[PDB]
Amino acid sequence: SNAMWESKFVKEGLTFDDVLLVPAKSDVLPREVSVKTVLSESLQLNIPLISAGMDTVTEADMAIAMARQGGLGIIHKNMSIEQQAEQVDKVKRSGGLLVGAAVGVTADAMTRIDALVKASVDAIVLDTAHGHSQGVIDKVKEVRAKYPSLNIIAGNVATAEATKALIEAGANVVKVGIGPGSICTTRVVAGVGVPQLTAVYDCATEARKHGIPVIADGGIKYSGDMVKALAAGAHVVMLGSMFAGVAESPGETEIYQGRQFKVYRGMGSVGAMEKLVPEGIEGRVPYKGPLADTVHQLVGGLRAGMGYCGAQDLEFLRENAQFIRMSGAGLLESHPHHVQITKEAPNYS
Amino acid sequence: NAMWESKFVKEGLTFDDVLLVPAKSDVLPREVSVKTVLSESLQLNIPLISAGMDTVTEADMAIAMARQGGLGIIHKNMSIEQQAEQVDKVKRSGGLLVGAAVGVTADAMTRIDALVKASVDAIVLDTAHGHSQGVIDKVKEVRAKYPSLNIIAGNVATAEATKALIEAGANVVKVGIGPGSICTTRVVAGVGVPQLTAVYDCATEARKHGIPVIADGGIKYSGDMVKALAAGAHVVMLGSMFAGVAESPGETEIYQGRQFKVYRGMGSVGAMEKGLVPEGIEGRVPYKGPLADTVHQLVGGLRAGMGYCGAQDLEFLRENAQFIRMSGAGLLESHPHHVQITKEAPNYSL
Amino acid sequence: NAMWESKFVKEGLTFDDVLLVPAKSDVLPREVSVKTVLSESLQLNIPLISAGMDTVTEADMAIAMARQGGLGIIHKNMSIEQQAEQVDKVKRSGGLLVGAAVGVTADAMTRIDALVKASVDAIVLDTAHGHSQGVIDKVKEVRAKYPSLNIIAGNVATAEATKALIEAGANVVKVGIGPGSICTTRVVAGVGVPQLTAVYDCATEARKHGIPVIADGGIKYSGDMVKALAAGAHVVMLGSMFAGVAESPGETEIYQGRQFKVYRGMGSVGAMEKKLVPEGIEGRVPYKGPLADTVHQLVGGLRAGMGYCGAQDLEFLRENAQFIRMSGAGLLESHPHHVQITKEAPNYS
Amino acid sequence: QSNAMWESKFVKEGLTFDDVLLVPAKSDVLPREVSVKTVLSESLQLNIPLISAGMDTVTEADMAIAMARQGGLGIIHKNMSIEQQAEQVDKVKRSGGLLVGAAVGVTADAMTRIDALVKASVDAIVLDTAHGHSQGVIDKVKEVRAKYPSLNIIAGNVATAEATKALIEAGANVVKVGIGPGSICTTRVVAGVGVPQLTAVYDCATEARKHGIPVIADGGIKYSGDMVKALAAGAHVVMLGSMFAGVAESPGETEIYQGRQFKVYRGMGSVGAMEKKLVPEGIEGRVPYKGPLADTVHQLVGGLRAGMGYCGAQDLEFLRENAQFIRMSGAGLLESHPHHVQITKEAPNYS
Numbered sequence A: 001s002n003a004m005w006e007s008k009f010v011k012e013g014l015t016f017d018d019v020l021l022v023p024a025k026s027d028v029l030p031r032e033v034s035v036k037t038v039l040s041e042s043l044q045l046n047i048p049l050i051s052a053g054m055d056t057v058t059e060a061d062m063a064i065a066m067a068r069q070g071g072l073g074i075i076h077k078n079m080s081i082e083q084q085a086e087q088v089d090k091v092k093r094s095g096g097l098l099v100g101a102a103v104g105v106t107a108d109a110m111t112r113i114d115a116l117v118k119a120s121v122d123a124i125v126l127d128t129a130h131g132h133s134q135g136v137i138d139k140v141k142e143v144r145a146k147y148p149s150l151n152i153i154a155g156n157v158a159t160a161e162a163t164k165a166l167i168e169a170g171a172n173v174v175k176v177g178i179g180p181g182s183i184c185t186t187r188v189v190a191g192v193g194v195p196q197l198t199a200v201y202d203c204a205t206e207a208r209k210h211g212i213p214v215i216a217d218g219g220i221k222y223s224g225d226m227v228k229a230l231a232a233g234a235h236v237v238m239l240g241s242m243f244a245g246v247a248e249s250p251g252e253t254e255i256y257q258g259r260q261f262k263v264y265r266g267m268g269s270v271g272a273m274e275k276l277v278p279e280g281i282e283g284r285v286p287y288k289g290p291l292a293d294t295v296h297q298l299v300g301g302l303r304a305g306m307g308y309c310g311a312q313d314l315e316f317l318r319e320n321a322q323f324i325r326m327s328g329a330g331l332l333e334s335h336p337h338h339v340q341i342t343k344e345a346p347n348y349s
Numbered sequence B: 001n002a003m004w005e006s007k008f009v010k011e012g013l014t015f016d017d018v019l020l021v022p023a024k025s026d027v028l029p030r031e032v033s034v035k036t037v038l039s040e041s042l043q044l045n046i047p048l049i050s051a052g053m054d055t056v057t058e059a060d061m062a063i064a065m066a067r068q069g070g071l072g073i074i075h076k077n078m079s080i081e082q083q084a085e086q087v088d089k090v091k092r093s094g095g096l097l098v099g100a101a102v103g104v105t106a107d108a109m110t111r112i113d114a115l116v117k118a119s120v121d122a123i124v125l126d127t128a129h130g131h132s133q134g135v136i137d138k139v140k141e142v143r144a145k146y147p148s149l150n151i152i153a154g155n156v157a158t159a160e161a162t163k164a165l166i167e168a169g170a171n172v173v174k175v176g177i178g179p180g181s182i183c184t185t186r187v188v189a190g191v192g193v194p195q196l197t198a199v200y201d202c203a204t205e206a207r208k209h210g211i212p213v214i215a216d217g218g219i220k221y222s223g224d225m226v227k228a229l230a231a232g233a234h235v236v237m238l239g240s241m242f243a244g245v246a247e248s249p250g251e252t253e254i255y256q257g258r259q260f261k262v263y264r265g266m267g268s269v270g271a272m273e274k275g276l277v278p279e280g281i282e283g284r285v286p287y288k289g290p291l292a293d294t295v296h297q298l299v300g301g302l303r304a305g306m307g308y309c310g311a312q313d314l315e316f317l318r319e320n321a322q323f324i325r326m327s328g329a330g331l332l333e334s335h336p337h338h339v340q341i342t343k344e345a346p347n348y349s350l
Numbered sequence C: 001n002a003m004w005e006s007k008f009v010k011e012g013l014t015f016d017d018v019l020l021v022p023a024k025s026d027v028l029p030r031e032v033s034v035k036t037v038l039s040e041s042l043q044l045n046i047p048l049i050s051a052g053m054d055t056v057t058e059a060d061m062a063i064a065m066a067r068q069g070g071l072g073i074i075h076k077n078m079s080i081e082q083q084a085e086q087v088d089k090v091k092r093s094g095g096l097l098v099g100a101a102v103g104v105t106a107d108a109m110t111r112i113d114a115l116v117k118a119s120v121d122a123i124v125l126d127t128a129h130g131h132s133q134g135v136i137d138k139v140k141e142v143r144a145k146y147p148s149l150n151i152i153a154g155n156v157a158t159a160e161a162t163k164a165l166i167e168a169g170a171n172v173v174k175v176g177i178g179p180g181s182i183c184t185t186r187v188v189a190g191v192g193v194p195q196l197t198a199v200y201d202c203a204t205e206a207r208k209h210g211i212p213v214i215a216d217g218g219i220k221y222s223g224d225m226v227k228a229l230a231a232g233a234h235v236v237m238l239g240s241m242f243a244g245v246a247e248s249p250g251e252t253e254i255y256q257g258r259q260f261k262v263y264r265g266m267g268s269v270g271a272m273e274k275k276l277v278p279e280g281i282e283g284r285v286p287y288k289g290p291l292a293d294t295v296h297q298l299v300g301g302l303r304a305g306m307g308y309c310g311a312q313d314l315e316f317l318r319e320n321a322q323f324i325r326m327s328g329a330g331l332l333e334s335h336p337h338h339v340q341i342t343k344e345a346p347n348y349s
Numbered sequence D: 001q002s003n004a005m006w007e008s009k010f011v012k013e014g015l016t017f018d019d020v021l022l023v024p025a026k027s028d029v030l031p032r033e034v035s036v037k038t039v040l041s042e043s044l045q046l047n048i049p050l051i052s053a054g055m056d057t058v059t060e061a062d063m064a065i066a067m068a069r070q071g072g073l074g075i076i077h078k079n080m081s082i083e084q085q086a087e088q089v090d091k092v093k094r095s096g097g098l099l100v101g102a103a104v105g106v107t108a109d110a111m112t113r114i115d116a117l118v119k120a121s122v123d124a125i126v127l128d129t130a131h132g133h134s135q136g137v138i139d140k141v142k143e144v145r146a147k148y149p150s151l152n153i154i155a156g157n158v159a160t161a162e163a164t165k166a167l168i169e170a171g172a173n174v175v176k177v178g179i180g181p182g183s184i185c186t187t188r189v190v191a192g193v194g195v196p197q198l199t200a201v202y203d204c205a206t207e208a209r210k211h212g213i214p215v216i217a218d219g220g221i222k223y224s225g226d227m228v229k230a231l232a233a234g235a236h237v238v239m240l241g242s243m244f245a246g247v248a249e250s251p252g253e254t255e256i257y258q259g260r261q262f263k264v265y266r267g268m269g270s271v272g273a274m275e276k277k278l279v280p281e282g283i284e285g286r287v288p289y290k291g292p293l294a295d296t297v298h299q300l301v302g303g304l305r306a307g308m309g310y311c312g313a314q315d316l317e318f319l320r321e322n323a324q325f326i327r328m329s330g331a332g333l334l335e336s337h338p339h340h341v342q343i344t345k346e347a348p349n350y351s
């Protein structure tokens, strides 16, 4: 059989910068469009935004701010079990807010999850580099066996088979993203990945049959990228780069060449794991001030995009929005071009 | 839901994706007719309209545009009395054609009343999303009150949106969602259609009704205008190539050692405040001098383009011009390459 | 609505979109014949013709081109008696082949007569749009007066334009609408055809009548010439790669301590002055020294390319060479990449 | 008729590394468990699928020794006399009985050079040639096969399936693939000839698999992932030049420029390599200094173990037979690299 040999270069993939959402007939204005989403009966968000579970993006201060904006924060796992549990307890104490927590597939995974459940965590995130492995499938089933009502967010994946395997394993939400992270080099050092917009659409196609929402994680650089991800099947997007520069994110502000910056590094980089083979890099990000100003520009772009597509809710955007593919020349026409920009826009660069 | 499996079926082309195919020509570029008829009371000698923006078109720009055979749309970022006076100023300047921009607001009727009493030739019901029930209901209200007033409705980018505004009374449909040089709509909202596909798709629906379409935004060089008109557009609307003109509002300022003019989107922070999630940027463009020199280069490129395609009038070019798709390597071959340019060209900058 | 539905059906390819597929070879590059025959009265030892531009070819350039085995086209930006003097000087220098470019004007016949009296080998009815009735009628007008004169009519880029000029009496058709390095026709008028497709489409029609086509413009490296010949062209025309040559008109101008020479398009403002809507730009090119060194690299790169394709002569390459289409990433792989070039090569600048 | 070749001129399409991505599949193995061993022949088995290029700025005695101790193979370049190369191969074989190869051109002194290398206990000779689909190369492969029936013969370079079949029938045990993809190469620019390397590897492996012949993916590998893509395209082993030139074991000394250390890396077809008139098919340049070879090899093998772990491949045969790609645009390439973040520190596998 040579079926696998002749199908190597058949599939095509698309990313955010390859398409545009086609405007449709609209009766609702951006001001009166609903942006709420339901990941599960216990996890309902006012805005479809989740801060990434990374050591440079989300701790308690970011999770508290995210939940108060209507979103969700994922406490990273690069800390002790008692430390992460103390932050989850700190968030839910500060007004009864939603909070998540990252958990790696390891031997101490169950012990870490036990402390988080005692801290009344709302969703554990079994985050790993390859969600389509048997070790993750087995560990997702163990958490469902011990905690039948616990929200399990499993990732990351990029194929329909992987999403189908995790849904059977007990995952309530499937996080899609293999490569697109702004600080990610997995596609470069390992050669493996799927274009994110095609990855979200392929995984959502399988997950919508079982009523399982998916999380588009990584690759979102502008507000429009989020609208393209949600319109491709995602119930919610996870952001890392666009949340690293906010004031509430962990770490202090640094001065470089006079301007204020913040440290943003991938969890697979050398510094974050402290002879290792990294799949991420360490970098800096401009300080953008408080989170409220960044969230406002994100939801504002979503409300504008939903107003164009005639979507009064994120379900109509998920079921009716149509894309149109474009070339590189179409992308340059989409951005500003042939004009010397004088000052900064709050929602562009 | 068949919509799910068809999400990524469509393809869209822009100006830099295609080239006009040269055909047999019995007419010289000097002998072609660039005239265009948009309605029974609106006929332009050149297919050029200056955008209704606070850095592009006012009284001085509209007067100059009409003297060249074009049309000028006075922007709406001013009081109703100030916009009506500039419309009257253009009309008393030799009987020139003039337009005015009106937003789809509750005071739109009050603004239109002053413009029609100022003998405005056309009103542009300009908004971000033309395919909304608010625009459809507004153009019908203007149609009922003024059955003979020319109504330009936009912006749209689909055939269904063009059908909605035509059947709602609009005489001309303006096409362009996201192509503007100062526009970030496709970036912040992720919504748009590649302009040449948008013009062609909208022109296909409007051609059934005998309705002209305006190609608005995305035109960086004079050749892009020839592609837009060949894709089905009766007339193009320019903003970037008109802001560096002396007749445009604002004064000259020295930047990068050269003379520059302020050019900003009407959806940017500065324009929305002087007349918050924006959909445009604030920038500047090189100073190009009087409008006469710029218009001559634009029309000259169109006359050359129509001469290559063998089109005597704009109808032949609209109905017979053929394109050919090219890659990015074709775009770099189309521009100058591997030669360090020493002097400016009047139709090619940098 | 057939014409309305077929507007965006055609697709064109240029040099940087393809590569020549290497084939079985029994001949070495040095043993390969590169001679070409454009007519019984015009055979060239090398498949190279210098462009008829005021900054590329005059008397001294045509002599050096002919003694290398090529051909020079004396441009038309000079008096009628001055051009006949230049054509005479080339024939006075050993009976060499020489051409002259004339425009489609009322004095075209008056200019051609003075050049035929000078025993010109080929007249070149150069034109921005060769598919015009004025060009077609003037080809019949010149052919009826000179049945034995070689007429190079252009420029065209479609098969229907090639056929229109052939039956008009033109025995050689020059192909190129837009690809010139100094050309802005595709930018100011929006009209053009990718040069590789334009040559292929014109060669397909011209080969039915045994008419050779000239690949004019768009050739920046020696490999682009091999692709143009492999597309069906008998000979290529160069302007940029011959402008920096000492034999080209004008003396050397210095810029940042380096030797340069002015290279401008015949449709640029400066060339036509010797209110105007130009289709070309004015620029400079690095001084490359004598023509013999540039031709050696060009013909040398052809011998290798013909060796890779197993072509003994230019007829086998025109009839058997295969291309393979590549993406922009293929072009980046084709050039040197991820290495800091320290020395400039004689054929790669 | 005769218009068959005329109408099929622009039909083929080619893919390179930056055109595709490996599609992750279900995996039961961890990257530390995967087997990276490969068998070009029973007398030439490499523990890692890495071969250093036979160039005067990449591989000599010190590099070939270091490559073999990591489980790879070094190809001694041919820009030296017969006694020098025979002694260079002898120096590697004396240094613990390590595997070593040597480059031999298709010339009159070819048999004289090969006889000195076979006596030096060489394990594989490489008929390195700009165009491997020539009759002189085909004749010279048969000539070596007739005299040394058990000698490993590596022939190249080719980029089509019919060329691969011609080299196999001539007697070559391994076929090198790569016409144009080299980082220092200008063949595709000066001669316009070539095939995108990932498509060339796939087409040549398709023909070579029918004869049970391994294929070497030569050239174009810029990062660790490009090797994984080349092996997943059907190649048994990859050959690297740019990613090995800046290694401390490479020939030549280091030079400091603006604080950073560099090392000269030039193509064999360049002027400088042929000098010690000419129409070159390569350029001369410099690459960053990467220190000892062990640090570069560790990242290469580490990235390969990660890719196979993503693809669910325990061995390299599973990756050759089962790995599926997905094609992407230039906008997919920018998403694959880091983006919109100012890199502050240099990663050991990404610069």
Ligand SMILES: C=C(C)c1cccc(C(C)(C)NC(=O)Nc2ccc(Cl)c(N[C@@H]3OC[C@@H](O)[C@@H](O)[C@@H]3O)c2)c1
Residues within 6 Å of the ligand: A105, A128, A129, A130, A131, A133, A135, A136, A186, A267, A268, A269, A277, A278, A279, A280, D027, D029, D030, D031, D305, D306, D307, D309, D310
């Ligand atoms: C890319 C990201 C996000 C990242 C984040 C932090 C760190 C990493 C690092 C850099 C450590 N690389 C990584 O882990 N590579 C990898 C490659 C292939 C596979 Cl198959 C796996 N498998 C996973 O580890 C082994 C088992 O635990 C298995 O169950 C689990 O799936 C992992 C990478």
Ligand SMILES: C=C(C)c1cccc(C(C)(C)NC(=O)Nc2ccc(Cl)c(N[C@@H]3OC[C@@H](O)[C@@H](O)[C@@H]3O)c2)c1
Residues within 6 Å of the ligand: A026, A028, A029, A030, A303, A304, A305, A307, A308, B104, B127, B128, B129, B130, B132, B134, B135, B185, B266, B267, B268, B277, B278, B279, B280
């Ligand atoms: C893009 C441009 C040119 C621009 C110009 C000035 C300002 C704007 C701003 C930045 C204000 N953004 C905008 O208005 N966004 C938008 C998005 C979706 C929709 Cl659905 C609508 N609907 C419109 O507003 C509500 C009703 O009045 C409705 O009738 C009308 O269609 C508007 C943008």
Ligand SMILES: C=C(C)c1cccc(C(C)(C)NC(=O)Nc2ccc(Cl)c(N[C@@H]3OC[C@@H](O)[C@@H](O)[C@@H]3O)c2)c1
Residues within 6 Å of the ligand: B025, B027, B028, B029, B303, B304, B305, B307, B308, C104, C127, C128, C129, C130, C132, C134, C135, C185, C266, C267, C268, C277, C278, C279, C280
């Ligand atoms: C592009 C090049 C090479 C070039 C070179 C020098 C000068 C030019 C200029 C800049 C002058 N532009 C030009 O001429 N534009 C053009 C456009 C359309 C047509 Cl249809 C034609 N028609 C031709 O001119 C009128 C008659 O002579 C007719 O017979 C003939 O076909 C010409 C351009």
Ligand SMILES: C=C(C)c1cccc(C(C)(C)NC(=O)Nc2ccc(Cl)c(N[C@@H]3OC[C@@H](O)[C@@H](O)[C@@H]3O)c2)c1
Residues within 6 Å of the ligand: C025, C027, C028, C029, C303, C304, C305, C307, C308, D106, D129, D130, D131, D132, D133, D134, D135, D136, D137, D187, D268, D269, D270, D279, D280, D281, D282
């Ligand atoms: C591209 C590389 C790697 C390279 C490396 C060093 C040097 C070269 C040079 C620059 C010398 N160019 C080269 O050799 N060009 C070439 C082109 C076509 C053919 Cl057909 C051949 N044929 C070969 O030479 C003639 C006969 O020996 C024949 O048997 C053999 O196949 C060679 C290039």
Ligand SMILES: O=c1[nH]cnc2c1ncn2[C@@H]1O[C@H](COP(=O)(O)O)[C@@H](O)[C@H]1O
Residues within 6 Å of the ligand: A052, A053, A054, A156, A177, A179, A180, A181, A182, A183, A184, A185, A186, A217, A218, A219, A220, A238, A239, A240, A241, A242, A265, A266, A267, A268, A269, A279, A280, A281
């Ligand atoms: O070190 C890394 N290697 C690979 N992926 C990473 C790494 N760190 C974070 N990610 C992923 O990338 C996402 C952030 O994407 P961003 O918004 O583009 O920065 C995270 O939520 C993770 O899914």
Ligand SMILES: O=c1[nH]cnc2c1ncn2[C@@H]1O[C@H](COP(=O)(O)O)[C@@H](O)[C@H]1O
Residues within 6 Å of the ligand: B051, B052, B053, B155, B176, B178, B179, B180, B181, B182, B183, B184, B185, B216, B217, B218, B219, B237, B238, B239, B240, B241, B264, B265, B266, B267, B268, B279, B280, B281
């Ligand atoms: O701020 C804005 N946001 C989005 N589009 C705009 C804005 N202002 C003007 N436009 C559009 O852009 C056109 C001009 O763009 P340009 O001529 O390509 O630079 C105008 O005629 C409008 O259709």
Ligand SMILES: O=c1[nH]cnc2c1ncn2[C@@H]1O[C@H](COP(=O)(O)O)[C@@H](O)[C@H]1O
Residues within 6 Å of the ligand: C051, C052, C053, C155, C176, C178, C179, C180, C181, C182, C183, C184, C185, C216, C217, C218, C219, C237, C238, C239, C240, C241, C264, C265, C266, C267, C268, C279, C280, C281
């Ligand atoms: O100014 C001009 N406008 C358009 N095309 C030109 C002009 N001048 C020269 N050309 C064309 O460009 C060719 C040379 O371009 P090059 O060889 O690519 O640099 C000439 O032989 C002409 O066919």
Ligand SMILES: O=c1[nH]cnc2c1ncn2[C@@H]1O[C@H](COP(=O)(O)O)[C@@H](O)[C@H]1O
Residues within 6 Å of the ligand: D053, D054, D055, D157, D178, D180, D181, D182, D183, D184, D185, D186, D187, D218, D219, D220, D221, D239, D240, D241, D242, D243, D266, D267, D268, D269, D270, D281, D282, D283
């Ligand atoms: O000068 C040359 N011209 C063309 N290819 C070359 C030349 N020199 C080396 N190569 C090839 O390029 C390979 C290495 O390329 P790299 O790994 O991409 O830098 C070598 O193993 C050779 O196959």
Ligand SMILES: [K+]
Residues within 6 Å of the ligand: A333, A334, A335, A336, A337, B178, B179, B180, B181, B182, B183, B184, B185, B186
């Ligand atoms: K834009």
Ligand SMILES: [K+]
Residues within 6 Å of the ligand: B333, B334, B335, B336, B337, C178, C179, C180, C181, C182, C183, C184, C185, C186
């Ligand atoms: K050009």
Ligand SMILES: [K+]
Residues within 6 Å of the ligand: C333, C334, C335, C336, C337, D180, D181, D182, D183, D184, D185, D186, D187, D188
């Ligand atoms: K190369």
Ligand SMILES: [K+]
Residues within 6 Å of the ligand: A179, A180, A181, A182, A183, A184, A185, A186, A187, D335, D336, D337, D338, D339
């Ligand atoms: K990435």
